[PDB]
Paper text:
Based on phylogenetic analysis that identified several FhCyLS-2 homologues in liver/intestinal foodborne flukes, we propose a new group within the cystatin superfamily called cystatin-like stefins.
FhCyLS-2 crystallized in an orthorhombic space group C2221 with one molecule in the asymmetric unit and a solvent content of 48.3%. The final model of FhCyLS-2 contained 93 residues (Val4–Thr96). While the positions of the C-terminal disulfides (D2 and D4) were similar, the upstream disulfides formed an interloop bridge (D1) in FhCyLS-2 but an intraloop bridge (D3) in the cystatins D and F.
Author numbering: 4 to 96
Amino acid sequence: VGGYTEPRSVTPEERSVFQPMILSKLLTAGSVVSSCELELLQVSTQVVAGTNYKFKVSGGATCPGCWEVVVFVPLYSSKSATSVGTPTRVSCT
């Protein structure tokens, strides 16, 4: 118990919030170029003291490849901030 849900489709509001956070992280880590079209393929969630969102993301023509990236969203009543994890390269299959 306490593991991830099965992957699911990403909501419009989730794309709006998390896609630029994940792009910014991949860009600052030197993993993608600034022109990268990044797609959130799916998300799996784990409820802790807050929520872990595990994304599988795909790059477009200038950033081909897939990464797994975990984002932590804490509870409002917490001293902790929203944190993007370290991206890991994964197979798109």
